[PDB]
From Swiss-Prot:
Domain notes: Contains a PDZ-binding motif that binds to several PDZ-containing cellular proteins. These interactions seem necessary for an optimal viral replication.
Regions annotated as coiled coil: none
UniProt name for this protein: RNA-directed RNA polymerase NS5
Catalytic activity: a 5'-end (5'-triphosphoguanosine)-ribonucleoside in mRNA + S-adenosyl-L-methionine = a 5'-end (N(7)-methyl 5'-triphosphoguanosine)-ribonucleoside in mRNA + S-adenosyl-L-homocysteine; a 5'-end (N(7)-methyl 5'-triphosphoguanosine)-ribonucleoside in mRNA + S-adenosyl-L-methionine = a 5'-end (N(7)-methyl 5'-triphosphoguanosine)-(2'-O-methyl-ribonucleoside) in mRNA + S-adenosyl-L-homocysteine + H(+)
Effect ascribed to mutating V160A: 10% loss of N7 guanine methyltransferase activity; 50% loss of 2'-O-methyltransferase activity
Originating organism: West Nile virus (strain NY-99)
Positions spanned in the full protein: 2533 to 2794 of 3433
Impact reported for R156A: 78% loss of N7 guanine methyltransferase activity; no effect 2'-O-methyltransferase activity
Site (mRNA cap binding) residue list: K9, L12, N13, M15, F20, R24, S146, R209, S211
Locations listed in the record: Host endoplasmic reticulum membrane; Host nucleus; Host cytoplasm
All copies of domain mRNA cap 0-1 NS5-type MT, residue ranges: 1-262
Length: 262
């Protein structure tokens, strides 16, 4: 259909099992989680290992200044807690509150003791779509249930964005919101309006797998929404037609350290 994003989606759903798994990691940056996995088994809760691949993703963003976490942090759809625990290590942050659905099929928050864990409070069993908004200085959201249907994803992304705006009008100046399907017309229009009222821009995280078109709307980014999205659709589409396959590119999963913060 229209938009490069839609052709990408069509081509993805047409791949065989083996090519789909090969393609999703091609040329993306991927942190090694071996040590984190063995620490979980041995119960090593103070080794400083992140609880998921999510922290390395948020680190990429914060390290490039796409946002500057500060004050009270609320993390919607915290899952295991990768973003909460990473935010707990930032000096400007003083409180981290995470909410996640939990329950069968969903990740439960993992309680570990990486640096600043005492400032973190995660509550499971909370479907954020029904929870009235709360005040915060930094708002984070990483919700986006994928679907083979681009229309389903468009609807789910709009739902997220309308939910997120309820927390934004409260005052959070700093934010990072995952936009599951940014290429569909309704999300493009919704984002253009959201960008007018709250600034920021769409950024493609190189740690994301090629099997998802997800991009992050962060407060300290800018630029045309259509341009940014199409640019990403092109990179994703180009990775399907390579003749030389190099697989995922290694990067160390940085240690969060341990201890508590005053
Ligand atoms: N309606 C919802 N309300 C609250 N949480 C949700 C909802 N839908 C999905 N989720 C959670 O959102 C999470 C998405 C994850 N990718 C978050 C990972 C997290 N950012 C990390 O770094 O570890 C999942 O754990 C889902 O269970």
């Amino acid at each position: 259909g229209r938009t490069l994003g839609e052709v990408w989606k069509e081509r993805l759903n047409q791949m065989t099992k083996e090519e789909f798994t090969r393609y999703r990691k091609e040329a993306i940056i991927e942190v090694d989680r071996s040590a984190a996995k063995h620490a979980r088994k041995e119960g090593n809760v103070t080794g400083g290992h992140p609880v998921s691949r999510g922290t390395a993703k948020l680190r990429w963003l914060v390290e490039r200044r796409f946002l500057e976490p500060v004050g009270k942090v609320i993390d919607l759809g915290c899952g295991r807690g990768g973003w909460c625990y990473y935010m707990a290590t930032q000096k400007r942050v003083q409180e981290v509150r995470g909410y996640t659905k939990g329950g069968p099929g969903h990740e439960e928050p993992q309680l570990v003791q990486s640096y600043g864990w005492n400032i973190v409070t995660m509550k499971s069993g909370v479907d954020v779509f029904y929870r009235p908004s709360e005040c915060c200085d930094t708002l984070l959201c990483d919700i986006g249930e994928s679907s083979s249907s681009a229309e389903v994803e468009e609807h789910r992304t709009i739902r997220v964005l309308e939910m997120v705006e309820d927390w934004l009008h409260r005052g959070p100046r700093e934010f990072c919101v995952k936009v599951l399907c940014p290429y569909m017309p309704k999300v493009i229009e919704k984002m253009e309006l959201l960008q007018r009222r709250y600034g920021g821009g769409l950024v493609r995280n190189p740690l994301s797998r090629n099997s998802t078109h997800e991009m992050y709307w962060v407060s300290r980014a800018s630029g045309n929404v259509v341009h940014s999205v199409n640019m990403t659709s092109q990179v994703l589409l180009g990775r399907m037609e390579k003749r030389t396959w190099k697989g995922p590119q290694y990067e160390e999963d940085v240690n969060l350290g341990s201890g508590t913060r005053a």
